[PDB]
Amino acid sequence: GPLGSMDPDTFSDNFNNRPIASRRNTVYLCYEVKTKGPSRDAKIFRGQAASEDKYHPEMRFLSLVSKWRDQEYEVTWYISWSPCTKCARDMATFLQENTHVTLTIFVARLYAAADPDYQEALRSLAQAGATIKIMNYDEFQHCWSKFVYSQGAPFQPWDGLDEHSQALSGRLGEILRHSMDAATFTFNFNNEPWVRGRHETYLCYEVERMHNDTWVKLAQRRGFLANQAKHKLEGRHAALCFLDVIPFWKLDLDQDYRVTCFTSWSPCFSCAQEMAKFISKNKHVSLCIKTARIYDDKGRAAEGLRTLAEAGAKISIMTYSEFKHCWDTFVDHQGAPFQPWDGLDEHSQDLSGRLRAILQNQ
Numbered sequence: 001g002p003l004g005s006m007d008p009d010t011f012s013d014n015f016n017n018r019p020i021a022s023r024r025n026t027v028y029l030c031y032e033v034k035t036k037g038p039s040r041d042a043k044i045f046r047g048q049a050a051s052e053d054k055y056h057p058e059m060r061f062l063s064l065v066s067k068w069r070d071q072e073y074e075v076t077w078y079i080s081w082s083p084c085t086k087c088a089r090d091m092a093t094f095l096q097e098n099t100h101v102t103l104t105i106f107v108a109r110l111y112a113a114a115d116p117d118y119q120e121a122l123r124s125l126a127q128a129g130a131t132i133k134i135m136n137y138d139e140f141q142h143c144w145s146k147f148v149y150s151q152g153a154p155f156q157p158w159d160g161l162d163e164h165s166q167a168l169s170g171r172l173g174e175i176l177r178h179s180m181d182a183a184t185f186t187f188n189f190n191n192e193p194w195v196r197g198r199h200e201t202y203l204c205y206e207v208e209r210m211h212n213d214t215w216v217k218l219a220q221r222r223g224f225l226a227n228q229a230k231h232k233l234e235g236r237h238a239a240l241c242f243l244d245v246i247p248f249w250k251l252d253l254d255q256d257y258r259v260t261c262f263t264s265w266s267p268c269f270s271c272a273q274e275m276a277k278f279i280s281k282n283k284h285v286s287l288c289i290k291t292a293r294i295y296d297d298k299g300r301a302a303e304g305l306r307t308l309a310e311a312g313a314k315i316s317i318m319t320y321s322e323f324k325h326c327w328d329t330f331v332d333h334q335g336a337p338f339q340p341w342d343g344l345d346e347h348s349q350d351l352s353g354r355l356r357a358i359l360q361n362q
Ligand SMILES: [Zn+2]
Pocket: 237, 238, 239, 267, 268, 269, 270, 271, 272
């Protein structure tokens, strides 16, 4: 194992998009610096380093891209975990201040845990002039063949490489676009009460401040999220993941707000109790939960919705207006209008009647 390299046991430990997470918060970055120009035979300078905080040898390339005569640089990152909340912002600053440097980042695992500032930092880094993509078979093979000391051993992938590297691609697309996919929305937000294959739960949310005598939308605070799930790397539900993102808003305690939650699946009993116990401790928030389908939760969901509404939560079923409003704001439509599926108003009124029955104690 030559110094400055990673033996195969270190590669197949950091660059592995399988569910397993990072209890040991370690990241490993491989960098390729090239002189921008016409040369297809340009000498690419490769290096690699893992996060070592004290001295930071992973940033030993920032001196390799100093402005030197009329030379531009192309940098290619093969980073293990997604960049940090502060590292991404600092790299955006550096890309803004150093115009002669272009950067292309390849991510193996995205930071599953989120924070509005983290998404903001990734989007600002993308705006700065960087290109972020998820590693697939080509990138994993190209990294194994130039940053791993393999004594002849060829690259052997895992079972679900593309199956995970495409889910992470969709996650990154949702993160960078600030809008989810149109097919994803037309799939998850369905109106029929009994469906199949809707394992994940998507949740959009809007905030409105009470100014003058009017709810004014805090348009800089709207956003969506999805559940985590999976195993072998557990995860919370979408409602609980929304109850975690609220403290990062720095809400004013003297004024009142209205928070609207557009949910694909209605909250279960655990999430309903957690939401009730949250809004009971934050009386400066009026929660209105507009849902698409009514999640039965094996029976214990009607009582959960009843308990949630007894604290002061406006539970309701999405109609055509709410579906179209969710289309024009949270999905990547690119100008296309909302074309609703057949039966929208029918299942809408049916689920409204069933919710009214549930709420009239039934
Ligand atoms: Zn739940």
